[PDB]
Every structure is written in C-alpha cells, then in structure tokens.
C-alpha cells in the first residue's frame, strides 16, 4: 500500500515542491502558467513521482485531484490556446506549444508520448478540434485530438472549480467543471 496526498491553498514565491518550466512561476498567492502575451508556454509539475500502477501486482491507483483556475483573456473573441491537467512520465519536458498545449506533438496517436491530459481548450484548431468550433473540455490520450469532448462556455475572468477522479476498478476517468453563477 502506497498513498500520497497534498493540498496547497496559497502558493509561495518559493514553492520548492513544484518544478516550473516555460513561463511557469508563482506571484501573489497564485500559480501563473502564462500571462496574457503571444506565443508562450508555462508548465508546473508536482515534484514527487507518483506510483500510479504496479507491474508486480497489476494494481492500478485510484486518485482524485481538485483545483481552481482562472482564464483571463482580453475578450471573448481574443482567447487562445487553453489549459491542461496532465499525467506523464517522470522526466517530462514541454512539448509543442500553441494548440498542442505544451503536452503533445501531433494529432496522430503517438504511443511514445505516454501522456494523458484533460484539456480546457479555448481555440478551434480546424485540423483536430470538434467542427462545431466551440470551446470544450477534452480527454486526450497520446494525441491532441481528444477521445471525448464536452462543449463548454468560457466565463472570462471567473474562477472554475475542477475535480478530476480516476476509478481503477472501472478505468473510468471523470471530469467536472463548475462555475459559481
């Protein structure tokens, strides 16, 4: 039996148990991944490696994460590219930016990626995004093209609460996003 658990409700200028990459940094109690500037990437990883399955037992972990984030764009029609929560190998580095969101390199299934991501995608990339062109939540498995998407209305400058949960018995990954009004 391994477990692991942690809670941060305010980020220190010196958050030593995070790894920052790109423009990632902490300022004011908060974790900033990008400011509102063109063509940039930020990531932040929790520093400890998690044991997610065991080759020996074939057990897989149950897990739940929750977080609050804000997207703050100059308007409803000037917003890109979006935001992920991702799970990846221990030595992960930023991948292609722009609509590949810092996590993937192609819309083709790339089994070397070994990355699962939940995206909150704010920009229609015609090559892979759902054709209704709306903004959306997706489950991504080794690809920028989601296996499943939910249309979602961005509320600009508002705090969303996300919970993401994985049931090991069922292999179901659930994502919920909530706004106050």
């Amino acid at each position: 039996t391994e477990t692991t658990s942690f809670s941060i409700t305010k980020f220190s200028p010196d958050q030593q148990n995070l790894i920052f990459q790109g423009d990632g940094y902490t300022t004011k109690g908060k974790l900033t991944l990008t400011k509102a500037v063109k063509s940039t990437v930020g990531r932040a990883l929790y520093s400890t490696p998690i044991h997610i399955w065991d080759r020996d037992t074939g057990n897989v972990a149950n897990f739940v994460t929750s977080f609050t984030f804000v997207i703050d764009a100059p308007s409803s029609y000037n917003v890109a590219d979006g935001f992920t929560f991702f799970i990846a190998p221990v030595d992960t580095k930023p991948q292609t930016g722009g609509g590949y969101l810092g996590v993937f390199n192609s819309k083709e299934y790339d089994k070397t990626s070994q990355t699962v991501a939940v995206e909150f995608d704010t920009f229609y990339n015609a090559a892979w995004d759902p054709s209704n062109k709306e903004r959306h939540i997706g489950i991504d498995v080794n690809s920028i093209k989601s296996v499943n998407t939910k249309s979602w209305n961005l509320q600009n400058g508002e705090r969303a609460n996300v919970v993401i949960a994985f049931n090991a018995a069922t292999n179901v990954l659930t994502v919920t996003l909530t706004y106050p009004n």
Partner: protein, 47 residues
C-alpha cells in the same frame, strides 16, 4: 451554479509508465490569455 461533466474509459496501465509526474500546462498563440491556478489538492492510493 453552472457545471459540465465528461467521462471516458482510459486504460492508464496501458498508456502511462508505472511512475509519473502530474502537472498543468498552458499555452498562448497569436491570440492569448493569462492562465492561473489558485489552489491544488491531490490524493491517490495504490493497493
């Protein structure tokens, strides 16, 4: 209150290594925006 829920079956043991790091990413292009996280909680149990 406004919410959205999505589920999918993902076979993690078949996609990710036994050990992983968890994290957030965000990017901007030609169009851009600030992307910030205010709080983060996490719990897992293996076995």
């Amino acid at each position: 209150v406004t919410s959205y829920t999505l589920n999918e079956v993902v076979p993690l043991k078949d996609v990710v290594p036994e050990w992983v790091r968890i994290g957030f990413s965000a990017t901007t292009g030609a169009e851009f925006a600030a992307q910030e996280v205010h709080s983060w909680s996490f719990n897992s149990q293996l076995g």
